[PDB]
Amino acid sequence: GWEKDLEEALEAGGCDLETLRNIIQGRPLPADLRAKVWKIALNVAGKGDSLASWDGILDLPEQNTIHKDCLQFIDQLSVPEEKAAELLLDIESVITFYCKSRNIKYSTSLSWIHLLKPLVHLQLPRSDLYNCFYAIMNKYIPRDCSQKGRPFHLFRLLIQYHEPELCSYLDTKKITPDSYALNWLGSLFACYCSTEVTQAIWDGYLQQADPFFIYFLMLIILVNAKEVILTQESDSKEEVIKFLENTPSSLNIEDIEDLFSLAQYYCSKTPASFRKDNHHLFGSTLLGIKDDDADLSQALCLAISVSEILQANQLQGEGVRFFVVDCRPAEQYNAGHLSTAFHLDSDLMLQNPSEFAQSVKSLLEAQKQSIESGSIAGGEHLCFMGSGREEEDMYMNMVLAHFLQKNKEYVSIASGGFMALQQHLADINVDGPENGYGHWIAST
């Protein structure tokens, strides 16, 4: 029924991905129409060949190392060897021209070969093979993925958000995401998964067109191995990493439906800030210069933009809601504070630990009653806010440490603290929410 509609819709019109998506509705793609929907998904309907203009032979200082890796793939697949040479020439030319067109130099640790595997299986011409690979690389593959930088820090923060206990174990044994999930992100599972299940993943992924979805897919794969990771404490660091690497290869075609539904579920319990404040990972690096003093290397937990805090709580429609915790001293708090925020005086932490403990007990009770009441203040997700000044906000380290050690899920920090709150409201000229009788910031 929908397949004939898809057939005709793809033929003529030059329709967008959005309309195409409405036809399929997450149903399995026909093999003969998979190339066209993938093309449309990657926004390469009639892009021209860039290899013809090149008119160059494969010459590079690291050309020898490229040749071996290309053969390994074709040797692994073992295609009909009459027209195997054709594919080798196309693959090796694509990599070299990409290495030339861009400044970057080739290495074996790159996951470039694995990205081509599912595209090669569709069996497109060299032109479309490059355009697809080029498109995927700037859309859905992080720039700093190769070096193992910010992209894996973001994943660590997600793991900590939803699975504190697991994250803590991994951090303790110094098993960072880059160790086991390098090729997860680099290849979009194409390194480990079989052609059939890789295709099923890539079908849904390209249709959805969400760069950060990989994080949620990767999370599910990791969470599925939670039991195994924690139970055994006998195996060495290297032995556990080895196991984790090949967890995606254990997937089957009937697992994929649940993988996506679970990814979307964990996504629905994750702040919008996760995506919105980290667009600089996929595009150019030049964007994200504006976000000064917001390094994921230095981050202890996920950072929430003040805008989301004010918006999210007003909705009250089974979404992500925040219980805001002002962590500043009583002097700063009383001068001006968010009117829906619990006051956790960070001065108590060291000076009177007993009264701080009582204050933490009150906090959790207040969060509970605020959720039950269905008030503007109530929310599952703990978001701690300081001054916003880097001079003062060391106590945030110790506050966050206190809750993280007790494996509290949904622990976040307010991006730019109370200073960013004042600035945000000042910028948009808003005093309070629409419904109610009070301003956001009060002196009592």
Author numbering: 17 to 460
Task: Show me the paper's own sentences about this structure.
The TBC1D23 protein functions in membrane trafficking and is critical for human neuronal development. TBC1D23 is a recently characterized member of the TBC family and is conserved in many eukaryotic taxa. In mammalian cells, TBC1D23 is localized on the trans-Golgi network (TGN) and functions as an adaptor to capture the incoming endosome-derived vesicles. Unlike many members of the TBC family, TBC1D23 lacks the catalytic Arg-Gln residues and unlikely functions as an active GAP.
After screening many different expression constructs, we were able to obtain diffraction-quality crystals of the TBC1D23 N-terminal region (D23N) consisting of residues 1–460 and encompassing both the TBC and rhodanese domains. The crystal structure of D23N was determined by selenium single-wavelength anomalous diffraction (Se-SAD) and refined to a resolution of 2.5 Å. Each crystallographic asymmetric unit contains one D23N molecule, and the final model contains residues 14–298 (TBC domain, cyan) and residues 316–460 (rhodanese domain, yellow), connected by a short loop (amino acids [aa] 297–315; gold color), which adopts a 310-helix within its N-terminus. The TBC and rhodanese domains tightly pack against each other and bury a total solvent-accessible surface area of 1,350 Å2. The two domains together adopt a V-shaped structure, with the TBC domain forming the base and one arm and the rhodanese domain the other arm. Similar to other TBC-containing proteins, the TBC domain of TBC1D23 only compromises α-helices, which can be further divided into two subdomains: the amino-terminal domains containing α1–α7 and a carboxy-terminal subdomain spanning α8–α16. The rhodanese domain of TBC1D23 adopts α/β topology typical of a single rhodanese domain. In contrast with CDC25B, the putative active-site cysteine residue C399 is localized in the middle of β2 strand of the β-sheet, and its side chain is solvent-inaccessible. Thus, our structural analysis indicates that the rhodanese domain of TBC1D23 is unlikely to be an active phosphatase or sulfurtransferase. D23N possesses several deep pockets lining the center of its surface, with pocket 1 and 2 being predominately hydrophobic and pocket 3 consisting of both aromatic and negative charged residues.
